Amino acid sequence: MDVNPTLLFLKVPAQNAISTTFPYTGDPPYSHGTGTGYTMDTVNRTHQYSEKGRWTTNTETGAPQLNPIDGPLPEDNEPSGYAQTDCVLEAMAFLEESHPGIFENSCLETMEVVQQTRVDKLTQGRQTYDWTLNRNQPAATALANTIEVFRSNGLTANESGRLIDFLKDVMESMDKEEMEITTHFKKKQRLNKRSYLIRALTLNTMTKDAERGKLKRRAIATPGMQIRGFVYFVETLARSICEKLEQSGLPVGGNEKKAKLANVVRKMMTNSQDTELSFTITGDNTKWNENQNPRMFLAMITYITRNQPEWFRNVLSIAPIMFSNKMARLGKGYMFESKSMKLRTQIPAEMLASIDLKYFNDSTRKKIEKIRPLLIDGTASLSPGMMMGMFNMLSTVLGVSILNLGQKRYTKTTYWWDGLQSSDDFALIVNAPNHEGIQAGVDRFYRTCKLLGINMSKKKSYINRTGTFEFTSFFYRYGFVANFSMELPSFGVSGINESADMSIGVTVIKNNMINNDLGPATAQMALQLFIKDYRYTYRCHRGDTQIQTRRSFEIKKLWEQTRSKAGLLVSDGGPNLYNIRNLHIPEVCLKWELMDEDYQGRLCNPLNPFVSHKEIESVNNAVMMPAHGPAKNMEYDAVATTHSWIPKRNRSILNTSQRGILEDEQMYQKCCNLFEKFFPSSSYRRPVGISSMVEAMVSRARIDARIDFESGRIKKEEFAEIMKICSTIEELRRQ
Amino acid sequence: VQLQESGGGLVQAGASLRLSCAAFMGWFRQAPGQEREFVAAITYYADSAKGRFTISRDSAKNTVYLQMNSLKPEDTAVYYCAATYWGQGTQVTVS
Amino acid sequence: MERIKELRDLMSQSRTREILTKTTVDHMAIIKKYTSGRQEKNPALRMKWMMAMKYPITADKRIMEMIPERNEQGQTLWSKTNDAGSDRVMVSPLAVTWWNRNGPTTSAVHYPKIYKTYFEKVERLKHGTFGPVHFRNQVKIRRRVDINPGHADLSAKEAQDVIMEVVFPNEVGARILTSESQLTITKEKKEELQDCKISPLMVAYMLERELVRKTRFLPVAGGTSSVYIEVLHLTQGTCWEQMYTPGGE
Amino acid sequence: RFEITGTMRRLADQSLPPNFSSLENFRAYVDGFEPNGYIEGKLSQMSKEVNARIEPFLKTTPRPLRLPDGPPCSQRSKFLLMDALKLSIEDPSHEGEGIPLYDAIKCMRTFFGWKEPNVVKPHEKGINPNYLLAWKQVLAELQDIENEEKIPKTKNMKKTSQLKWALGENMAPEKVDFDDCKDVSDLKQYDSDEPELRSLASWIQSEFNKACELTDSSWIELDEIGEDVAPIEHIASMRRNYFTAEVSHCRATEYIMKGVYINTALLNASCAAMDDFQLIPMISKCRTKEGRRKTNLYGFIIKGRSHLRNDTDVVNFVSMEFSLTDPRLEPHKWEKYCVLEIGDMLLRSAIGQVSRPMFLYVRTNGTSKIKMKWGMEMRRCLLQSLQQIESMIEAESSVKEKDMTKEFFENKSETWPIGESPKGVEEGSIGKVCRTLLAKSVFNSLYASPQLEGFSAESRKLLLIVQALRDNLEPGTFDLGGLYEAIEECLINDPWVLLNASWFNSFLTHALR
RNA sequence: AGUAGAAACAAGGCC
RNA sequence: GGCCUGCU
């Protein structure tokens, strides 16, 4: 007899055992080298899906741009980006009519937010492409570098501390004859108008790793800092709009998505009488981002912001204006090998414009030949369409408009449709009195989608009777069925620290028990395995064992020293008291009454040199990138113990010409620590104002010395010493 | 905690018997003319049964065993298993 | 005394003097987050990879003057080589366990008073009474429920001023809290935590967690109470219901 | 005031539809625009070939997935799974308890019958004498440790030319600048093409078959948990004990422990001894039916230079494992192995005593930080499998208002289709389903690859379509040929994915009736 | 050689 | 031969 697990589906329905079809117990695919090939392929594919448009050359950037809008209507089922302006404007108008007051309200709240938003909001972001160094750097670092360059060039309106003022300075920089940047190898280099325009309109391309569910790798993009404020405002407007649309599912979580899917299916099927047939289409959109033209987003926003202050319209329109002229950096480059001479070489992507094509294979040779005409200063113009879901929410708005355009008031026919859209994925429930009606409805829905630059993937889509469908790895079969294979990768040690890892693991087990219908015995097994892996990872074994490690000696002496050994934490080699009933309690508090007072005091000592807290945002928040989803943050319950240390940093900056960044880091951190000691609320509430550091610090020294004498340790001798030391630092700052 | 005793019956004097209880554990007995008598617990044994009888347990099978040897007519009782919960008892008759 | 003294020492050197002079208060946050350290994409892989090194964690410089450089057999506990972009020094994990067996001891009696939420959870569970498990299909319907069982009927911003006035009374600014509920909360949490020396930031964070109301969407069947939702994993399942009554009731 | 002016205004004039000249004019047009049935006009004018016609999906529609043809598929695992041999000592130590080298030496001294090693099956691409010399070097240095005072916790080996070749040392081309190497004709890109095509072989099927079989040992010693206080906790503990009794005596659990231990040791050695080659004996500790604890030594691993910077950087090692399976019967499964003859073994059998040969499978393999990390988390296969089984049990128990675990595991009345025999489809008890799912998860973790992910997704789609067909839900497709081509492009050379495709074809053949 | 698979590793750089 | 780094 030959064993075959798949035959199990002959008795258990597919959805009731779908977890077996998710090989999420092995290493996910990773990219190894350059992503330049993928970037070039994506650029060429985006440009050839809109080949029948019209070509122009921008007078500012001098780059060739392709406009397919209002182009010839498609005559085949292949992907097409020839969106029609009038059709999309009409779709938005019908969306407004079905939801009166949506645009005006959303614009009002967006106007409030834009005129009260601060610059620091831009620091709350992941890697961004700093143009000062032409590389990806943390959002805060890139923002600081750009602000420094602007201030050195004379653009100091951002000193007002307002994001709108920062954007005003950004736009004013566009009209400058010559800017100056700094490079280390420090050298001051001058950038002319066109070079700075291209550096501000460019995107950095990388390869996406840890992407499960496809054989081929893809490319993703990261924009600069000049354009992120406009993107933030536009996405704020789009989120405020989608929050008023029940057909959208992008700005919500997973459980809300499931609830809305259940509600829509029940509404569609229940209202349908015996005569009407119902069919569900589990649709995926092929080349979703490559076929969405930024000009059409400009049209949608300018229709949304009608009868609004002109400044609001301008600030919200700046973003799509820059995306329509966006450029993409090709990537890291290409690495060549010569086996005859036994050597390797790494050529940067910027040489692709001039480098001969003898080194490249046929596929890459043709890709380079096709993309060369669009190469301007080492970057390729990508006007026709978006690169990687930067305007997720606006795309969801367009999809929701398409979904609502079939409310049976615009169809003008017996058939009708509804459903749920989340960018690149949708479920469409279509009802009609007969199979011919369903066919006509789906055909018209597809045709209308093709008029908006949205394509339906026929290969990854199928239609059945309502009651069974899929949506973003959520399988609905007369009710959503748990999978538990999507969350399997999150059952190990997170990698934050000991206490954080313990709390995160127990909380993940608890949550997957609540949401993903994890069984009790399975949860106990998960707890046991997690504890085993945790002890084997942090070298913290039970203590009563003879497992020799680098940490087994101190742990054993602590074990033999303690009297009530049941109170020792698993991190210190103690027994595990966790169970299904204790999954919502931190380890420290669960073992508090069992700890010896000496060990308890040594553990939770504020003066410990290991605990370090930076800001209110990073107290008990851990960023865990979930499998098959975007990066997410979790609140984990933990007590600040000596085990809450933060791990070592990379330390490879020491071998790079960018070595002075560490000295600047140290000096900035010293100044920030001094300010915090002067202003204790610096972390919890970020200080605001327009004065400089030393003014506030010296003046508060004055006052605090005064009052702490009026009652406290200070003495006249010390108070006068502080006053004249303040005068000394004053005259020092003078010179 | 539900408990089922097995392994009782009619036996010869001087014979041997292995009681088992499928489920801390005790074995207790009740003769027809009396209340509960302590036998063994898990180890400790009563004076009337010490050296003759052995209590053991498998915590992976969830079972407590009472191995009775060199049985006397005075061991004739219903033998009940108990968890710190009562079984229904298994009849042991020695003759 | 000291604080202004390292201030003067910083202003002595030209670079830090320039940083202090030209940098305005508003930019405080930016430069504080200014770092070359990228946020890790795969934390688990490197935590499993770094812990195999010697000196894998980081600690303040003060550790060099509280913990000896080596233990009894000579296993090193800390190194004097500083981190990449900080004055902290890289140290071995043993320096943690050492601190828990011979490090300085204090009076942790006030931690229960600080971490009110977690200890209240423990107390509620310790006095709970379980019941029989009933096996029947559960119709889990998704609903919006409040998870925090100690929220004082305050929002984030609404309680943020209360938290500042409780911890940072001088940086409150214009705001003087009007609602009398906030008055009593300030009085209680002021007299209760009058000398607690854990940290201002952690105290503020835990006060925010305790007082601020927070809500999330979850699949529930029955219950719906704040105390009954924290144990939602233990009382409700796919085909079984476990009757439970927390210690509070 | 937020005024668009200067260069940024001109950019706004170049981001409009084709027939617009200025942002002012376009905004005026938008403000003056009102819906006047424009979608209908273009829908009528648009060509009718733009359609989404639904193709009915019937029993006769789906065709079997085509498998690639070529040379048979080879073995890719980092250790022997079906052909492993165990040398034991019967010590009382626990899994992590003990010192590796002393345990390995003590286990190896338990076997008598060593012979001078000789080549049996060559690597066919390497230098087998290097493997022979490496084996003899390992033996010599093991004796060298045996002689001295106290067995070191970790040993470093000498860097002889033998292991320099076997571990691929000083073979990475030296990195230079392009401006200095441009006239070299041979200079070109790295080889970037579709992998070699290979056809499925019957050995993977038998390997999976015997990976789901019971054993005479318990290969899982679970940790401690808080004493159960609630009745639901008691039910959970009883269920967990049942599953542990079912799966502990399973070759899948032994493979899990082998992989976890090997990858943990390899990662720790790579992170600690980055420069110098290190010896690590393959150790796994089990418990016999009698209850006596026992250690088992499959062989040795020599880790090489492991200066791993990126998550994809490769650390090369050489693995040696004892076995009794003659490699002269399925040579195509051992394309990358070099197999020597090292001794003779005598296992008690009623046919006098066999006195079988005892060979050494030696090969050069490699891994990476990501692969090591994911192979050291193989214990979540237990989770996956037993979560599936517990979901089955809960779903069935929601029907009958009572816990149904005990009768499922003891009565064994209900059975699920878990394989096909030439007679027909064979059904097994719930425990066999547990073991089968555990083996499937273990093989997913062992033979993981992008092909597996792609095939899994594109075949789950077709499985859902087929399930809809079997449920009488009138399924339909827009382009089924496209889906088939998407599935068939994932099957290239991986034995596991090809076996999964064969299983899918068999399921289609048995289904659709 | 080997790992791996649309490009890489099989140490890097600095003296 | 000596020293530096391992997500920059």
Author numbering:
A (entry chain B): 1 to 185, 207 to 756
B (entry chain F): 2 to 24, 29 to 47, 54 to 95, 111 to 121
C (entry chain C): 1 to 249
D (entry chain A): 204 to 716
Paper text:
Central to the replication cycle of influenza viruses is the viral RNA-dependent RNA polymerase which transcribes and replicates the viral RNA genome. The influenza virus RNA-dependent RNA polymerase is a heterotrimeric multifunctional machine composed of polymerase basic 1 (PB1), polymerase basic 2 (PB2) and polymerase acidic (PA) subunits, that catalyzes both primer-independent replication (vRNA to complementary RNA (cRNA) and cRNA to vRNA synthesis) and primer-dependent transcription (vRNA to mRNA synthesis) in the nucleus of infected cells. PB1 houses the polymerase active site, whereas PB2 and PA contain, respectively, cap-binding and endonuclease domains required for transcription initiation by cap-snatching. High-resolution structures of the complete viral polymerase from a number of human, avian and bat influenza A viruses, as well as influenza B, C, and D viruses have been determined. These structures have revealed that the polymerase is a highly flexible macromolecule that can assume a variety of distinct conformations, enabling the polymerase to perform both transcription and replication that require different initiation and termination mechanisms.
Using cryo-EM we determined the structure of 17 polymerase-nanobody complexes at resolutions between 4.5 and 6.7 Å; this is sufficient resolution to accurately position each nanobody bound to the polymerase heterotrimer. Nb8192 and Nb8205 bind to PA residues 426–445 (site 4a) with Nb8205 also making a minor contact with the PB1. In addition to the core of the polymerase which was resolved in all structures, the PA endonuclease was resolved in the majority of structures (excluding Nb8189, Nb8190, Nb8192, Nb8196, Nb8202), while the C-terminal domains of PB2 remained unresolved in all structures. Nb8190, Nb8191, Nb8192, and Nb8207 caused a significant reduction in viral titre at most time points tested. Nb8190, Nb8191, Nb8192 and Nb8207 were shown to significantly inhibit viral mRNA synthesis. To probe the effect of nanobodies on this interaction, the binding of purified recombinant 1918 polymerase to a Pol II CTD mimic peptide consisting of four heptad repeats, phosphorylated on serine-5 of the heptad repeats, was measured in an in vitro binding assay. Nb8191 and Nb8192 were found to significantly reduce the binding of the polymerase to the CTD peptide. The site bound by Nb8192 overlaps with the polymerase dimer interface that has been identified as important for cRNA to vRNA replication. Binding at this site would therefore prevent polymerase dimerisation and, in agreement, Nb8192 was found to inhibit RNA replication for Nb82057 which has a binding site overlapping with that of Nb8192. Although the site bound by Nb8192 has not been shown to contribute to Pol II CTD binding our data suggest that it might play a role as Nb8192 also inhibited Pol II CTD binding and transcription.
